[PDB]
Design a protein around this ligand. Structure first.
Ligand SMILES: *[C@@H]1O[C@H](CO)[C@@H](O[C@@H]2O[C@H](CO)[C@@H](O[C@@H]3O[C@H](CO)[C@@H](O)[C@H](O)[C@@H]3O)[C@H](O)[C@H]2NC(C)=O)[C@H](O)[C@H]1NC(C)=O
Ligand SMILES: *[C@@H]1O[C@H](CO)[C@@H](O[C@@H]2O[C@H](CO)[C@@H](O[C@@H]3O[C@H](CO)[C@@H](O)[C@H](O)[C@@H]3O)[C@H](O)[C@H]2NC(C)=O)[C@H](O)[C@H]1NC(C)=O
Ligand SMILES: *[C@@H]1O[C@H](CO)[C@@H](O[C@@H]2O[C@H](CO)[C@@H](O[C@@H]3O[C@H](CO)[C@@H](O)[C@H](O)[C@@H]3O)[C@H](O)[C@H]2NC(C)=O)[C@H](O)[C@H]1NC(C)=O
Ligand SMILES: *[C@@H]1O[C@H](CO)[C@@H](O[C@@H]2O[C@H](CO)[C@@H](O)[C@H](O)[C@H]2NC(C)=O)[C@H](O)[C@H]1NC(C)=O
Ligand SMILES: *[C@@H]1O[C@H](CO)[C@@H](O[C@@H]2O[C@H](CO)[C@@H](O)[C@H](O)[C@H]2NC(C)=O)[C@H](O)[C@H]1NC(C)=O
Ligand SMILES: *[C@@H]1O[C@H](CO)[C@@H](O[C@@H]2O[C@H](CO)[C@@H](O)[C@H](O)[C@H]2NC(C)=O)[C@H](O)[C@H]1NC(C)=O
Ligand SMILES: *[C@@H]1O[C@H](CO)[C@@H](O[C@@H]2O[C@H](CO)[C@@H](O)[C@H](O)[C@H]2NC(C)=O)[C@H](O)[C@H]1NC(C)=O
Ligand SMILES: *[C@@H]1O[C@H](CO)[C@@H](O[C@@H]2O[C@H](CO)[C@@H](O)[C@H](O)[C@H]2NC(C)=O)[C@H](O)[C@H]1NC(C)=O
Ligand SMILES: *[C@@H]1O[C@H](CO)[C@@H](O[C@@H]2O[C@H](CO)[C@@H](O)[C@H](O)[C@H]2NC(C)=O)[C@H](O)[C@H]1NC(C)=O
Ligand SMILES: *[C@@H]1O[C@H](CO)[C@@H](O[C@@H]2O[C@H](CO)[C@@H](O)[C@H](O)[C@H]2NC(C)=O)[C@H](O)[C@H]1NC(C)=O
Ligand SMILES: *[C@@H]1O[C@H](CO)[C@@H](O[C@@H]2O[C@H](CO)[C@@H](O)[C@H](O)[C@H]2NC(C)=O)[C@H](O)[C@H]1NC(C)=O
Ligand SMILES: *[C@@H]1O[C@H](CO)[C@@H](O[C@@H]2O[C@H](CO)[C@@H](O)[C@H](O)[C@H]2NC(C)=O)[C@H](O)[C@H]1NC(C)=O
Ligand SMILES: *[C@@H]1O[C@H](CO)[C@@H](O)[C@H](O)[C@H]1NC(C)=O
Ligand SMILES: *[C@@H]1O[C@H](CO)[C@@H](O)[C@H](O)[C@H]1NC(C)=O
Ligand SMILES: *[C@@H]1O[C@H](CO)[C@@H](O)[C@H](O)[C@H]1NC(C)=O
Ligand SMILES: *[C@@H]1O[C@H](CO)[C@@H](O)[C@H](O)[C@H]1NC(C)=O
Ligand SMILES: *[C@@H]1O[C@H](CO)[C@@H](O)[C@H](O)[C@H]1NC(C)=O
Ligand SMILES: *[C@@H]1O[C@H](CO)[C@@H](O)[C@H](O)[C@H]1NC(C)=O
Ligand SMILES: *[C@@H]1O[C@H](CO)[C@@H](O)[C@H](O)[C@H]1NC(C)=O
Ligand SMILES: *[C@@H]1O[C@H](CO)[C@@H](O)[C@H](O)[C@H]1NC(C)=O
Ligand SMILES: *[C@@H]1O[C@H](CO)[C@@H](O)[C@H](O)[C@H]1NC(C)=O
Ligand SMILES: *[C@@H]1O[C@H](CO)[C@@H](O)[C@H](O)[C@H]1NC(C)=O
Ligand SMILES: *[C@@H]1O[C@H](CO)[C@@H](O)[C@H](O)[C@H]1NC(C)=O
Ligand SMILES: *[C@@H]1O[C@H](CO)[C@@H](O)[C@H](O)[C@H]1NC(C)=O
Lengths: 318, 173, 318, 173, 173, 318
């Protein structure tokens, strides 16, 4: 009357992990894996995305032609990285809808600039100022042309420029607001008159407003920046009597995967597809708690700092 | 578990079992041994790897989006941008919380299921030659040498060989 | 010692279908059903929604009274369908916040127009232009009144119109921007002066800007369109000295299920509740991959082109 | 399946069974036959139809919304409109992917469950007159004519009638 | 239920049972009695309370948001604000509908599971001294006084004491 | 040959509840619990949030200093409650981007006002009007200063005010639009001239527009309100020649959990963390069907009015 015994069973481990389920906020399993990326290496990887470090320059300063940003001329980028240390070091300016211009340029992803020979007859070109020095000599925004009188006269400008190309043209121009009446007349020999940049499909008119603003870099005047997009078959019509900061050409507009990010993280020679303002992070996990701002193939941001996915059975010690 | 095997009628796991997730322990005239079952172990592992493949390595490319930090007070438009992003983050945070809870509940249930399948598999093999003691162990009512235990472990145990011996030992007064 | 055998089992089929589960990206079941609608019949069904085919006319052109859009006067619609072939064939115009006016009119769902006898004493009415021909004779927007001098004089207009009704009134008006100084004076005998349309609850003032724009349909001038909503008990006050393109009445504003869609799909005599720019699609399925733009009872748009729902057990061939 | 019947101890399905989803095959002195079980078949079908009713035929009326295609560059406001719609589409796409995965896992589990219920139902009917062979088949230890098989199929089989005959054949040396 | 016990081989519930969710009814020479099983009852209750803790008492603080009712026609910007809020509400409404459906399906399955665990527990206790009648009731083949029924209810029933008596009554011609 | 019987079973109840599952829209369980809060107590609880009942005053009226809102000076709040009965009882005014000013003030959560001694030499201060009575005597907005000529002269104002503090300053100012030419000259002795409020980082210029608007409280003129935020180290520069409604100081700007709500529910002495325009509601449940507008720790709004969560097994009567 001999017998035997056969017991079925499962394994267990001495170091289990707590996970959540539908019915239990704390249940221990043999193994788990983290689904939330919570740490950053620290630095932004210069690959595989084309990074452009703005250094002391904002995107708009490089666009206009701030002398300290001349190295940026005609550069492309997948991601433009603006630094908090940045500062404008040229003629004081403001942009109505600054955020929108910054966005559409960042989304375009290029600063390619083609020069066009505008017919400025009867006017002086290449105006300069002591507040915008280039090579220690008085200069101006590299992509803008400060127009002034020639023989103490400033005639009505009615200039034309057609877009006979296959692509769109982005024109950046501005209006000068002299700080005093005497400056208006010594610059344009006339009382401030409105400017009008128009196309077959649009129309923008601006009034120069003379008056003193708080001085910045020893300048009580101001420049206001505007932009116009001219599509193929359309024409750019400038209609001014003074105070015009004219364009020297146009920028190309592209459509793609480019953008811009505010960050103070250093650029390194590594390879990572996901970029946050804190630096690049791995993207093996489906979620991340590092930063809501991301660029590239990134995990989705969530508020939890940890989420354990069970990869083993329940742990039952002896 | 919904089958009552793991943390159920199986009182606890075996830390000495390192070559598999499920297996057999036996006692006979030749001693006491342990061996892992490969099929049930591999069934649970493959299902869990299937979960991971869906969740790991698959991310989404986003490039130009909206601004999410602001240095100036703007009012209406800024309120909408903050609200949109806050709404988005809360919904994804909810998805992540529910996903892990559901996945973990299912993982615990499926590993309990594989334990029960092996138990059922073994019970049917033994037919009338063994009885379930209630704690995942079978009393086998015949001499069971190591080669006979091996035959049960890889599904070649022939119950007719020992049936006469087993029925006599089960139904003795 | 006779016996019998009883085997339990399940069916299987020779042509199974692959579906996804939580643990398996490819598992075959006996039958499944598609949950993503991915195909369009091609055409928009004129039922059960009241469709209005814009043909050569945009919504704004019908609103203003472009001669080729006179058949649209006082029409209603559930969905207004704009065509890409559309073009303006009247006086050149632009609308500040064009998108918003287009939206609120589309959401209102009607072009019902009531005429009101404005008291235009001391001025000539019914101004015409060769660029806006109706029946081969020079005309203008059917809902706008181009005012001009009478006996070489244009007095200050200070006209009143009260909303003693139970509903809101939508007023569409405009400002003329003559292309030259001589045109301003031969039209209004005065230098361009600002217009001011006001109510108890609002105030809009516009400055006419004389100057040449690129010619369109042989017209260097421009008209700028504005709108005002006057609620019950309120009053419309027009205060101009020239350059006024006045209203001949007001539009009714309604609240409902109306909207507008851009599409080039033909209208057909079928019945389908869901409309996309690609055409009407069935709405039996819960999701669709046809177009993110929809109107009516439609499936929700998703990026997947297929999602199989298992409607049978796992398939296990012999 | 979590019960180990379909694609488990049931080796494969029957393509020759076209009148139901589950059923019985038998062999006796009168031949070999096949018949479908209506209750288990109808239980699985009704549960699946219940899933379809929730998912099919129920859609949402939307009329005036936002613009989703743009012909001009506008900047900030346009970025928000694109972002809102992109955010929406991704969340609904996620819901659709998770829904189908969960529903399909549940459908496979519930059809495996109905197979197991029928197996359990039949096992209890036979009491001590039959033994489970391990592959979904029962060895019945008594003469079983066609009318006796029929009685098992619609739940009127009286085990006491054959118990004496069956116990003698089971416990013979 | 996926185990086929509740609304399955258990024909109906007991309204006379008010001291627990699961239990035992018996008949012996001393009469007919009813008693509740505490462990299975507490297992189901604790799982359901676990669901409630996750869902109850946990809400989200929101303060300054966007406007959601409008007294004037504004056009584009207003359309986006209405759309954002409508999009949000539909996604949360979907989450709430799916959550309750999934939770309720799981709650019905887990209470059916606890019924089956108790049935399995009891079946193994009785070993060869009882037979399953098919409707959740066991025929016990030996004299079973109230103290013997009590021993089965709290897991101290010694089957060897009655095995000889039971086998004789089961295998009598 | 004696035997016994042991039946296993489950409980049932005479009053079950219907719930939904994945496979069944109507299945009865022994017990359930409601997850959607659908009822409101009726009133807003004055605890634990600091409620500020606006009564007859809007937030802007309290900000400007409408006499009937003087009791609100320097008040804080977690939630500001505006009533539909509210009305302006002072000088008629309008705010460009009214919604944004209302929002940023509501989010700031305070009306703390510091007075600053602006140097208004050569001008008369404390202008009054019969439409804005305080204590039955003609007065004005308590936080605005209506400037007028002194000895029939109004010189060019070029005033300065620096923000040498550690926090931001919110300045509320306005522009007067006289209803007639004679009013402009008897007020400022000159033709209406533009105003210019500027900082190192911003610039706002406004043109007064003379002309009659529909009379409100017997006033054909109008005031337009503007605001400026001056950050530390920056300066406020006002540059006007008349028509200036100047500030008497600045408001503090804070960042926190404050907001505003439109409601006509009475305030009561109860304690409830969730506030809706319908009143406070319990927040034990995870969802609510009361109102999409909420403040505080609230359940999330859903369209369903009921959702039963099963808290018991399936109910199977005998
Ligand atoms: C309106 O008033 C402001 C000040 O109340 C005037 O701005 C100031 O113009 C003076 C020139 O007389 C500047 O003084 C100079 O300032 C520098 C400091 O950067 C100092 O080093 C010089 O020695 C000299 O004192 C002053 O800085 C400047 N401040 C500003 C612009 O904020 C303004 O000119 C007046 N407007 C008009 C149109 O008169
Ligand atoms: C500012 O300059 C532009 C061109 O540089 C002037 O616009 C042009 O005005 C002339 C009239 O002298 C138009 O010439 C005519 O054009 C048609 C072509 O459509 C042609 O068939 C006629 O025979 C004649 O040559 C020209 O088209 C027109 N172009 C525009 C408006 O784009 C404009 O008049 C100048 N502005 C002022 C205020 O003088
Ligand atoms: C432009 O025309 C409107 C009316 O067509 C003028 O507004 C009106 O001005 C008169 C003063 O002559 C006001 O009349 C007074 O009205 C009150 C009613 O509140 C009445 O009780 C008095 O006895 C007197 O009749 C009239 O109310 C007022 N209506 C408005 C402003 O809506 C306006 O003055 C004209 N504009 C110019 C610049 O002349
Ligand atoms: C816990 O489970 C995870 C997931 O299966 C295992 O993580 C893997 O570890 C192996 C090394 O054996 C790597 O090849 C994989 O790339 C890892 N994947 C992840 C997501 O981390 C992990 O090894 C398991 N841990 C233990 C201790 O068994
Ligand atoms: C746009 O250009 C036209 C033509 O160049 C300007 O019109 C001339 O303006 C001068 C100076 O104002 C006048 O003296 C002439 O009488 C005008 N000439 C013609 C041919 O009409 C016009 O002033 C410009 N507009 C703006 C806003 O600068
Ligand atoms: C990544 O950087 C962000 C800042 O952009 C950090 O998020 C902030 O953390 C700081 C404190 O270091 C707080 O002052 C902010 O209020 C936080 N903002 C948010 C949105 O959380 C974030 O903590 C950093 N993450 C890591 C991992 O370094
Ligand atoms: C696969 O399952 C679907 C869903 O149950 C069945 O689709 C139905 O087909 C019937 C015809 O028998 C129609 O009455 C229904 O309207 C169909 N519904 C849907 C959603 O398509 C389908 O018949 C099944 N296919 C097979 C081959 O069995
Ligand atoms: C609004 O209407 C008033 C009155 O009709 C205009 O004021 C008159 O304007 C004329 C011409 O400009 C002057 O000569 C008169 O002295 C004014 N009359 C009165 C009664 O004041 C006013 O100009 C109009 N405003 C606008 C912007 O057109
Ligand atoms: C329905 O029409 C839309 C266009 O409005 C199509 O979506 C586009 O497909 C074209 C190519 O035909 C691409 O150029 C676009 O980039 C697509 N846009 C999007 C958002 O996908 C769509 O493919 C059409 N669908 C069907 C079924 O015909
Ligand atoms: C139905 O189940 C709910 C949830 O478990 C029970 O609700 C609780 O009732 C008790 C009183 O016994 C309170 O202590 C809890 O605060 C309640 N919670 C909720 C969410 O309501 C309820 O008692 C059960 N009903 C019945 C009749 O058994
Ligand atoms: C801003 O202030 C300056 C100086 O106070 C004003 O310029 C003076 O204006 C008066 C009256 O217009 C002129 O007569 C003087 O010739 C100017 N003085 C100086 C020192 O230039 C200027 O007008 C003001 N600007 C505005 C828009 O009001
Ligand atoms: C809470 O108040 C809101 C109003 O702000 C109510 O929602 C409205 O109900 C009214 C009828 O009383 C309708 O005219 C509106 O169209 C409704 N709006 C929405 C968004 O539903 C709501 O019914 C009130 N709720 C309770 C419980 O009193
Ligand atoms: C940026 O500016 C700082 C001083 O403001 C200067 O020291 C540094 O060299 C500048 N960097 C570049 C790249 O111009
Ligand atoms: C530039 O434009 C003027 C118009 O005033 C014209 O007279 C002149 O010829 C143009 N110059 C050239 C080089 O075409
Ligand atoms: C202005 O400068 C450019 C290059 O910087 C030169 O080509 C052009 O001739 C200059 N114009 C004048 C008027 O000096
Ligand atoms: C099972 O194991 C035995 C050893 O005990 C071996 O002899 C037999 O071949 C195995 N069965 C196989 C490989 O199918
Ligand atoms: C639309 O315009 C085209 C030419 O542009 C013309 O041939 C066609 O007849 C027009 N259709 C209508 C309905 O006016
Ligand atoms: C029209 O308005 C003028 C105001 O200038 C008034 O004199 C005239 O009587 C009005 N005409 C009618 C018909 O009321
Ligand atoms: C203008 O035309 C309308 C109809 O088109 C007519 O009733 C009105 O009398 C006309 N006015 C003049 C001044 O001719
Ligand atoms: C079950 O089937 C048999 C035929 O084998 C039939 O006689 C009997 O009535 C059936 N039971 C029913 C209908 O309840
Ligand atoms: C089980 O119940 C019996 C009463 O029938 C009691 O004597 C015994 O001690 C109980 N077992 C325990 C408490 O472990
Ligand atoms: C609000 O205004 C009404 C009349 O409009 C007045 O009766 C009531 O007393 C006012 N309440 C307060 C608090 O001023
Ligand atoms: C006020 O400003 C004027 C500038 O016009 C100046 O002359 C005067 O001294 C200032 N007053 C005081 C008290 O500083
Ligand atoms: C204006 O009123 C304030 C207090 O209301 C007072 O301090 C100031 O002196 C007054 N100014 C004049 C010019 O009366």
């Amino acid at each position: 009357a001999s017998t035997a015994t056969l017991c079925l069973g499962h394994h267990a481990v001495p170091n289990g992990t707590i996970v959540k389920t539908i019915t239990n906020d704390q249940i221990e399993v043999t193994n788990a894996t983290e689904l939330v990326q919570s740490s950053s290496t620290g630095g932004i990887c210069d690959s595989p995305h084309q990074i452009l470090d703005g250094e002391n320059c904002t995107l708009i300063d490089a666009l206009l032609g701030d002398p300290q940003c001349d190295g940026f001329q005609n550069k492309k980028w997948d991601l433009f990285v603006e630094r908090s240390k940045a500062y404008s070091n040229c003629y004081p300016y403001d942009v109505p809808d600054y955020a929108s211009l910054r966005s559409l340029v960042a989304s375009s992803g290029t600063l390619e600039f083609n020069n066009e020979s505008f017919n400025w007859t009867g006017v002086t070109q290449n105006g300069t100022s002591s507040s915008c020095k280039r090579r220690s000599n008085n200069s101006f925004f590299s992509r803008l042309n400060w127009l002034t009188h020639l023989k103490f006269k400033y005639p009505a400008l009615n200039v034309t420029m057609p877009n006979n190309e296959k692509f769109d043209k982005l024109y950046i121009w501005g209006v000068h607001h002299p700080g005093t009446n005497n400056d208006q007349i010594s610059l344009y020999t006339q009382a401030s008159g409105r400017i009008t940049v128009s196309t077959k499909r649009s129309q923008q008119t601006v009034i120069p407003n003379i008056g003193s603003r708080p001085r910045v870099r020893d300048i009580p005047s101001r420049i206001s920046i505007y932009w116009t997009i001219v599509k193929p078959g359309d024409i750019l019509l400038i209609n001014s009597t003074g105070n015009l900061i004219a364009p020297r050409g146009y920028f190309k507009i592209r459509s793609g995967k480019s953008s811009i990010m505010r960050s103070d993280a250093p650029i390194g020679k590594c390879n990572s597809e996901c970029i946050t303002p804190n630096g690049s992070i791995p993207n093996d996990k489906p979620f991340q708690n590092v930063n809501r701002i991301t660029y590239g193939a990134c995990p989705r941001y969530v508020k939890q700092n940890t989420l354990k996915l069970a990869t083993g059975m329940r742990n039952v010690p002896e | 578990g919904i089958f009552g095997a793991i943390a159920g009628f199986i009182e606890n796991g075996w830390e000495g079992m390192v070559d598999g997730w499920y297996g057999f322990r036996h006692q006979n005239s030749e001693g006491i041994g342990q061996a892992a079952d490969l099929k049930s172990t591999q069934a649970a592992i493959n299902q869990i790897n299937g979960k991971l493949n869906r969740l790991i390595g698959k991310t989404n490319e986003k490039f130009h989006q909206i601004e999410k930090e602001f240095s100036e007070v703007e009012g209406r438009i800024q309120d909408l941008e903050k609200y949109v992003e806050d709404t988005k983050i809360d919904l994804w945070s909810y998805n992540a919380e529910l996903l892990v809870a559901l996945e973990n509940q299912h993982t615990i249930d499926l590993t309990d299921s594989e334990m029960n399948k092996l138990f059922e598999r073994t019970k049917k093999q033994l037919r009338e030659n063994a009885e379930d003691m209630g704690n995942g162990c079978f009393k086998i009512y015949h001499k069971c040498d190591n080669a006979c235990i091996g035959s049960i472990r890889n599904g070649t145990y022939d119950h007719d060989v020992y049936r006469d011996e087993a029925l006599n030992n089960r139904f003795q007064i």
